[PDB]
Symmetry: C2
Subunit: 137 residues, 2 copies
């Protein structure tokens, strides 16, 4: 195939890089069936006790309908609950076990292998120029 | 908020940069109403006269049903017909889009980051999609 002027677009490579990383993420954290978003959601609810849904969603760039959909299924699966009695969620013991198991899988097979592929200096380079993009573009 | 490990995971950073790139693209290409996938699909379908549907979708990492849905829209818009053949209007929407992507969006990326830093990014990004 003639890929033409797609090979000249940073937009394109970023999007294919993003997709590949996701597919690997998923394959690694398939013992616990978390998507990268469910992962980031459980991680932020654990690390931030006493903060409403408003703040998790907007921080991960997730839209309010979509976020409410997400939680409902996290709740459905038994990984979070609302405080009792609410708009503050808390994980459950299973939630923390799913999160801990997932940081394990994420760090071991996935992130390290990714890191070796490029080395520290370039991984660190990439984290930088990606962060500059989301913040400043 | 306490982001924790997110701060330095590559998947998270790549999805945030990706999300913002798509948003900006969508804005500048708004006067032709293409997502980056559709733009990519017309570009491919223009630059590859004769090449069959199944060669395009696999190259762009799109499942077969999803692809059919995209084409139905484009064709419904008058941008192509059925192997796939970009129309006149398809050809003019791509030509507008091409300028808009190239003169309102990608150069401001390179401008943001630097002429050496942006090239380096493309190549490292390309290295993950290919090898990882």
């Amino acid at each position: 195939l003639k890929m033409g002027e797609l090979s000249e677009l940073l937009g394109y490579a970023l999007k294919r890089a993003q997709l590949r990383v996701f597919e690997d993420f998923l394959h690694c954290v398939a013992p616990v069936q978390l998507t990268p978003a469910q992962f980031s959601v459980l991680l932020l609810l654990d690390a931030n006790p006493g903060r409403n849904q408003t703040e998790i969603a907007t921080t991960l760039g997730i839209l309010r309908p979509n976020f409410v959909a997400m939680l409902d299924a996290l709740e459905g699966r038994g990984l979070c609950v609302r405080t009792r009695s609410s708009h503050i969620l808390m994980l459950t013991d299973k939630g923390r076990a799913t999160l801990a198991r997932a940081k394990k899988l994420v760090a071991t097979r996935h992130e390290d292998r990714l890191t070796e592929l490029l080395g520290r200096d370039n991984r660190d380079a990439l984290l930088s120029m990606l962060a500059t993009i989301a913040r400043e573009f």
